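#struct-pred

JT: dropping the chains for the assembly here, can someone run the whole complex?
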Amino acid sequence: XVVXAX
Amino acid sequence: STGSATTTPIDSLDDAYITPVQIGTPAQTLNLDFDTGSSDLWVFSSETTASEVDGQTIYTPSKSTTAKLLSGATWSISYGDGSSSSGDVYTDTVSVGGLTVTGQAVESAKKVSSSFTEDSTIDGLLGLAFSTLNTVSPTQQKTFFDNAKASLDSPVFTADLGYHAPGTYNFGFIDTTAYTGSITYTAVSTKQGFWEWTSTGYAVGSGTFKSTSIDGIADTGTTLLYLPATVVSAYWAQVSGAKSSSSVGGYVFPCSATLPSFTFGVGSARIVIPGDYIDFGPISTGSSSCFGGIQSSAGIGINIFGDVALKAAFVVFNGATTPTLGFASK
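RK: done, full complex below.
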């Protein structure tokens, strides 16, 4: 898995 | 005032950590993901499309005596991994570890993407990056950090993430018990909204430290440690069965291997990630291959110091007028 504000 | 809460990993791989937050009066406890990589506090609610809600606890603004609708305001947000939510906005009372902010905007999910609906353990996010990233329209709303800093004993919060174990977020003071040695602080650039910082370089196992700028983000809400391509290849060159796998998305290695440690520089200090931390877990239960915790940022476009990195440290988010980031070994 998880990549949090792209 | 201060605030202290326990953060628990949502699974046996430390994919993410949840911390209970009390919203509304009487208190409704939701388990949120505290995400230093975004600036939206958002919740699954009585508003969320029913068919998009599976296992999560919802926020019902209608049962909160303190809730008010912020009229006109909407939000919509997407993240790093593709996922996304939108909806409308209430302000309400929100407490974390007994620290209480009134008039906090609490973004009510009307819709959520499939990966949110699929993860029964996370009831929402609480954003802790700079308020400039807040997606509420037409007037952006402050984070719970921002809103609490008038009342904190100091304008800071710490993250003390555990390895396959609980840990702590603290607001408004620094627990001198939770770490060893001293904290070193390094400057942060807010130019893109993040907790953004320059590491002074890196070492693999017992090999030499290489002075190299590596700009990136400390992100409690990304699982892994995402490095430029050449730094990552230097690390896995040290593990004999690791390879880049296109099929799984990254470096994999035999669950059999003892991984070397990985050192990152903070100014003149060094934080060592033990090699067990970079063993992410097998690729599938029972497999003999394991997924690497250190991966190329080449796809993502910016380096992220993710939970794999920050969970080997004690980390101070200094939100003074010029912010700083603090790392200590623990």
